[PDB]
Nucleic acid binder design. Structure first.
Lengths: 292, 48, 55, 48, 147, 35, 49, 48, 146, 49, 69, 109, 49, 99
RNA sequence: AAAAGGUAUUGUU
RNA sequence: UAUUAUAUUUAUUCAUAUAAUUAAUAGGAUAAUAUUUGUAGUUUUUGAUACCAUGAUAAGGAUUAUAAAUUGAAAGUGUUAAUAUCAUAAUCAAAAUUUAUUAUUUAUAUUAAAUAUGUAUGUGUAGAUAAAAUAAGAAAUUA
């Protein structure tokens, strides 16, 4: 076969075991495959969503001196408008997630208000406490959205429930104002938000936006909350991207896939002459225009 | 907003600031505050 | 070489050949050849020096 | 017991995804078992 | 020019001393107008139609002024900042390399080492008192000849 | 939580024995797969 | 000339801007290349086996 | 890589990498090498 | 730390002799004791274009090397010194998340980033001979010069 | 120092430059308009020069 | 034209920015407690040319004006 | 040896992570460009503008060697356009009078 | 016998042929060139005599 | 937005954070007026500069170029109060230059 | 631009 | 459907290689003295070769785009870093076309400097073929 032999690279002072084992493989049935990635100091925490395991005084110092994280994220996003920095989608996305942190509780309470025909008297402290304790444990991750909604629609309300209902409701589906007032009260009693009006605003606007859909108040129980297989976030039900619903539009060059770097592209991983055929850099401009 | 790179200079002149301070005042409604917006239009060297 | 080290070292290429000699004559033998610059001392060893027959 | 199952991220690209089974228990009453698939030994262990 | 100092770029104007502040780090600077260009230096004839301080809720200058420390940051570039002169010695610089410093100008001391360690060529002096030797110097010895 | 529960940082999350013996399925579902 | 006149009488900039006399055609030849027979555009003859 | 080796004096990849000095660090003089001054050999020439 | 500097104030001496030759004061009409140090300076900081055309001979380099060798000094020398102890940096309590990695290396002298005179044990030229030798046993991770 | 482009005179510290060697008016803290008149007289001695 | 320069820039050791007349005494703040009280300047010690002990301003931890003329 | 300058004062980065967000991890038929930032590029230009390095006097950048990038000779320490001009300089001109060819020719005359 | 004559070359290996490491010390830049100015013990005795 | 953040101070940040939406409005304030205000205050028509004419000399020195390299001219355009039309290129009459 | 199979398990040579 | 055009132009006669020994350090004037002027232990190994002797960087356009922007890519094309065991093949002039992967000068004036191509006048003329939307100027049948 003219068989190829690769002597295994052994660890050295210079070339450590980790690199010599992942940057190199002695079995050449993987050669020239592609570039893998992994995350280190802060990329790992950013992706893995591992919350800091708290402590007493020290974690509480780091945690108390936090201040308005949503704002400080915004500060860090805009500061990319200064001279020495560029506005970065990574900053915008840290802002976007620091603002969309309470997605779970919001999508839930919206489902509760608007998908639960006849939810007792939610303003009555009984069902209000069911609501508070469930949404409280929907945030804080102790409960899932699906199981918590079942706990809500299953909690104990009033004996002879259908019989009390068929006296108050023709088709069974009551007025939703008590419900949404209860949910806004929920998220403003539980400090789900640092800036209070935000709770109500999302609670209100997500509902308003859904009010436009066909079957705007039915949800297929599978996709409705979390499960194995879900919908893309543009297609989630009470989500923030559902209004960001759009798409892209492409006119490719005759040579468009080749030039994948030539444009004014931001490079995280800069090219070097070993992969770079004739590319010059994202700053060069062969065809300049005169201007003061 | 002043120019901080020679790009903003290209969209910049005081005689153009005039048409815009006029937007300010034509949209303004009271003269006690057209007073301060005209004070600023004269204080920033707007080519009146 | 004689200044910084002691000895005068071979080329990296030569010491490659010599290491391969060291090892491919460790696991196996009987593939070599005896090409020299001068053969008078091999065809004519000194008064002693009766080489060993291997196995 | 750890294992190894080849993962085909593409027709051309295959990885060795080691597959762990492990049970984290304490005879004090509480014990669960998790099996995982992950490319590396310690990462599959953590996942499980 | 009647210099008043031997050093500064404009020697020909004095040194106007300025007022000390016991609140030495407690000064404040408005930044929407740093240079105090927004002030009344004389009462105007348009001063009369002035609506009172009513509904002027957040007088923008009061919320634009900064204490002085705020405008610039002492970032690691400032913590590894390199000098704007030839330092006489950086032996004390225990923040030399691991901490991230490199001098902007070789210090006098290591220039002195680099001058001393090596000789001076005799062909750098160009002494001359005799003149050019018209006849011999070019037909001088065939070894020390001017090829 | 902060992410959806039908995926792990390595792919889809394996639920049953099929997923665990054939983990291609978790990270490959046609010429248009994306993470 | 257009910039000369904008500089001598400014308010003439607006007709010059609008008429596009202060416009720079951001154009040049294809640079000098040996892979092109004329140096500019034509790649040498391609032949299949 | 190779029998005809790298030469550490011309090559930018060597001279610049982390085990040497990069061009964007301020390329100064790192330490003054006074060698001919600590102890200078006596003048002894082969040729008498 | 790097040398006795005003040895460089023995550089003008040859220029002093040139300005003497041009002032008409014969250098042989000095003292012999003073001419001792001055002939020393002329073989110290003074060279003729002919000796400069061939003073950088490799064997001249290497006889300086061998003389330093048999006089037992290879610390100042470029080739004949091996600095195996590469100094580490001050870690940062404020940024404990970054796997710090280098931008350069220099074989600076050891007094720059040193463990201070109290943070180290007392005098170690005498009481504790410190030698960083290489382990004969194999080490994968962990320095070779322990 | 803390405004746009402090002229080179504005990086050197607030050192007690001798032009307060003579002013017997201000003792240690110039009272109201005391500094303003001392500065007017700085102008006066400058017109003097 | 720095005032009293003949005592400040010329003869004040530390250029008038450095304050010498103090102790290494410990103060219970975490900054000033890091400095142990140093037993005083040795009575009959022959100290170096650049280093003093630090009891006064004229005898500071690092003499600043040269011995040049 | 002469191979001992090529030693090291940390412990290494450990490959203990998953791929960062939107990294191009190869699915079946994703044409993969390993280089482009996965977020900061697709972030629309209507927002971000065509800047790929700070708007700052080009003499602060140096074109890298071997790397199709451009880095600044002072290691990321920046001075804005307005440090390369007189105070309040009109269009950051050297002297607010005339442009690049106006100066030279006023001078020739 | 002598200590400082420590190994500056490694055990003659294949990491020479397989890796880019430098088989010789990179030349220094701020090093002078080694010349001989120095008087021996006998030579100094002669001048003192 | 960035610049409205900049115009803030430490004290005003500390203050208008206690409402916990005040500072988001302090920053996005122009964006609030935008997203709620169906109007573009901004259509800045055309930039209109100052005259930069060589005072003593009566000339305007204006640059021009074609192909960015191969043609790069400058007009010295001078005011002529005597109605005597004359256009010059490279020191010669324009008709004889441009054929 | 949108929906598709394998007795192969780097897998139609 | 829209976020928008190929049916035009210029093109095709195509070639260059030669006369074997790659194994190492050796300082010289204006320097307080080495004839070290002229430093003499032969013959125990063998790969980069005429010969198997792993790796590693090209050519190739068909849908990320319009504004302050480039119409050139990784899948590796001879010389390169671990397989040995047929043989010296290497430019210092004057040189021997079979090699697909090439843009030749077109009828007024024709050999002077290291010498420098003597063949193919023919109705712009079979077949199939080349290039290009980029400072030139092109306009209408989307998968």
């Amino acid at each position: 076969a003219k068989r190829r032999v690769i002597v295994p690279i052994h660890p050295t002072p210079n070339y450590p075991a980790h690199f010599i084992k992942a940057s190199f493989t002695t079995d050449p049935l993987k050669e020239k495959q592609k570039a893998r990635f992994s995350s280190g100091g802060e990329a790992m925490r950013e992706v893995q969503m591992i919350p800091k395991n708290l402590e007493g005084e020290r974690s509480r110092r780091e945690l108390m001196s936090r201040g308005d994280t949503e704002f400080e994220a915004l500060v860090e996003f805009i500061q990319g408008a200064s001279y020495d920095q560029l506005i970065s989608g990574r900053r915008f996305k840290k802002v976007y997630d620091k603002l969309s942190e309470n997605d779970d509780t919001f999508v839930w309470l919206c489902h509760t208000a608007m998908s639960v025909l006849n939810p007792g008297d939610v303003r009555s402290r009984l069902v209000y406490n069911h609501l508070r304790t469930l949404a409280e444990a929907v945030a804080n991750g102790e409960m899932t959205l699906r199981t918590a909604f079942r706990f809500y629609e299953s909690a104990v309300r009033s004996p002879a429930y259908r019989e009390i209902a068929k006296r108050q409701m023709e088709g069974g589906a009551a007025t939703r104002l008590a419900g949404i007032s209860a949910a806004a009260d929920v998220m403003r009693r539980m400090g789900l938000t640092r800036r209070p009006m935000a709770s109500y605003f999302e609670l209100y606007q997500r509902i308003v936006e859904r009010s436009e859909a066909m079957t705007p108040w039915g949800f297929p129980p599978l996709f409705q909350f979390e499960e194995r297989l879900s919908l893309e976030p543009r297609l989630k039900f009470f989500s923030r991207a559902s209004q960001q619903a759009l798409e892209r539009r492409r006119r490719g060059h005759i040579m468009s896939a080749y030039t994948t770097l030539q444009g004014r592209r931001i490079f995280w991983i800069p090219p070097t002459w070993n992969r770079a055929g004739r590319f010059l850099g994202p700053h060069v401009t062969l065809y300049p225009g005169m201007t003061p | 907003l002043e120019p901080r790179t020679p790009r903003d200079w290209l969209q910049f002149s005081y005689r153009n600031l005039a048409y815009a301070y006029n937007g300010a005042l034509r949209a303004c409604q009271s003269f006690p505050e057209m007073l301060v917006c005209y004070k600023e239009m004269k204080q920033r060297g707007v080519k009146v | 070489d004689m200044t910084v080290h002691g000895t005068s070292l071979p080329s990296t290429y030569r010491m490659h050949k010599d290491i391969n000699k060291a090892q491919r004559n460790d696991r196996k033998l009987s593939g070599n050849r005896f090409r020299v610059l001068c053969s008078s001392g091999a065809k004519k060893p000194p008064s002693g020096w009766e080489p060993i027959p291997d196995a | 017991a750890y294992d190894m199952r080849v993962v085909k991220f593409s027709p051309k690209d295959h990885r060795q995804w080691i597959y762990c089974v492990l049970y984290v228990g304490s005879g004090k009453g509480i014990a669960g078992w998790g099996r995982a698939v992950a490319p590396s030994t310690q990462e599959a262990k953590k996942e499980a | 020019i009647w210099q008043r100092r031997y050093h500064g770029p404009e020697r020909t104007v004095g040194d106007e001393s300025r007022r000390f502040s016991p609140a030495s780090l407690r000064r404040y600077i408005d930044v929407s107008d740093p240079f105090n260009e927004k002030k009344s230096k004389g009462e105007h004839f348009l001063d009369k139609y002035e609506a009172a301080r009513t509904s002027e809720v957040a007088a923008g200058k009061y919320r634009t002024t900064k204490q002085i420390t705020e405008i610039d940051q002492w970032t690691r570039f400032d913590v590894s900042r390199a000098d704007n002169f030839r330092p006489l010695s950086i032996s004390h610089r225990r923040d030399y390399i691991r901490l991230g410093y490199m001098h902007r100008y070789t210090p006098w001391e290591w220039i002195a080492v680099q001058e001393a360690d090596q000789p001076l060529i005799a062909e750098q002096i160009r002494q001359d008192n005799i003149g050019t030797s018209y006849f011999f110097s070019l037909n001088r010895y065939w070894r020390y000849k001017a090829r | 939580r902060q992410h959806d529960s039908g995926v792990n940082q390595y792919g889809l999350k394996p639920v049953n024995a099929y997923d665990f013996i054939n983990p291609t399925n978790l990270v490959n579902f046609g010429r248009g797969t994306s993470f | 000339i257009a910039n000369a006149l904008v500089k001598l009488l400014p308010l003439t900039r607006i007709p010059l801007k609008k008429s596009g006399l202060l416009s720079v055609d951001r154009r040049r030849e294809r640079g000098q290349f040996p892979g092109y027979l004329d140096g500019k555009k034509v790649k040498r003859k391609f032949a299949k086996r | 890589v190779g029998y005809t080796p790298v030469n550490p004096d011309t090559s930018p990849m060597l001279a610049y990498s982390q085990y040497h000095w990069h061009y964007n660090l301020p390329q100064g003089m790192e330490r003054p090498h006074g060698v001919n001054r600590t102890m200078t050999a006596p003048y002894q020439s082969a040729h008498s | 730390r790097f040398g006795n500097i005003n040895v460089v104030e023995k550089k003008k001496i040859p220029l002093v002799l040139a300005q003497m030759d041009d002032l008409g004061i014969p250098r042989a009409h000095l003292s012999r004791p003073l001419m001792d140090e001055v002939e020393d300076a002329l073989r110290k900081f003074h060279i003729y274009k002919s000796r400069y055309y061939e003073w950088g001979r490799a064997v001249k380099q290497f006889n300086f090397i061998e003389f330093r060798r048999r006089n037992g000094w290879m610390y100042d020398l470029h080739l004949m010194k091996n600095t195996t102890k590469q100094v580490g940096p001050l870690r940062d309590f404020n940024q404990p998340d970054a796997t710090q990695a280098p931008v350069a290396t220099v074989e600076i002298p050891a007094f720059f980033n040193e463990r201070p005179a109290w943070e180290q044990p007392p005098l170690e030229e005498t009481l504790y001979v410190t030698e960083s030798r290489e382990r004969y046993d194999d080490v994968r991770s962990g320095d070779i010069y322990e | 120092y803390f405004k746009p482009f402090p002229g080179f005179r504005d990086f050197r510290l607030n050192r007690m430059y001798r032009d307060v060697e003579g002013f017997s008016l201000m003792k240690q803290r110039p009272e109201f308009l005391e500094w303003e008149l001392f500065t007017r007289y700085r102008a006066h001695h400058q017109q003097r020069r | 034209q720095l005032q009293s320069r003949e005592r400040l820039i010329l003869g004040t050791h530390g250029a008038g920015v450095v304050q010498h007349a103090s102790v290494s005494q410990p103060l219970s703040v975490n900054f000033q407690s890091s400095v142990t009280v140093a037993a005083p300047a040795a009575d009959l010690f022959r100290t170096k040319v650049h280093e003093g002990t630090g009891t006064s301003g004229k005898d500071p931890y690092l003499r600043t004006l040269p011995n040049q003329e | 040896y002469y191979w001992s300058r090529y030693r090291m004062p940390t412990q290494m980065p450990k490959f203990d992570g998953p791929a960062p967000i939107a990294a191009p991890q190869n699915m079946n038929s994703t044409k993969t460009n390993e280089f482009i930032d996965p977020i900061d590029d697709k972030f629309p230009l209507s927002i971000r503008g065509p800047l790929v390095r700070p708007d700052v006097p080009e003499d602060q950048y140096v074109d890298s060697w071997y790397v199709c990038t451009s880095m600044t000779h002072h290691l990321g320490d920046y001075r804005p356009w307005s440090a390369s001009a007189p105070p309040n300089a009109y269009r950051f001109r050297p002297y607010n009078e005339f442009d690049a060819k106006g100066r030279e020719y006023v001078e020739y005359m | 016998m002598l200590s400082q004559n420590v190994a500056k070359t490694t055990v003659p290996s294949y990491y020479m042929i397989r890796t880019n490491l430098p088989q010789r010390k990179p030349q220094n830049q701020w090093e002078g060139v080694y010349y001989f100015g120095g008087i021996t013990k006998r030579q100094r005795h002669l001048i003192l005599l | 937005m960035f610049e409205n953040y900049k115009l803030m101070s430490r004290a005003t940040l500390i203050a208008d954070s206690a409402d916990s939406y005040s500072h988001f409005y302090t920053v996005l304030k122009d964006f609030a007026r935008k997203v709620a205000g169906e109007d573009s205050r901004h259509q800045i028509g055309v930039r209109i500069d100052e005259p930069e004419v060589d005072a003593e000399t009566g000339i305007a020195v204006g640059r021009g170029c074609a192909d960015g390299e191969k043609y790069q001219f400058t007009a010295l355009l001078r005011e002529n109060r005597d109605h005597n039309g004359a256009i010059t290129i490279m020191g010669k009459p324009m008709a004889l230059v441009l054929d």
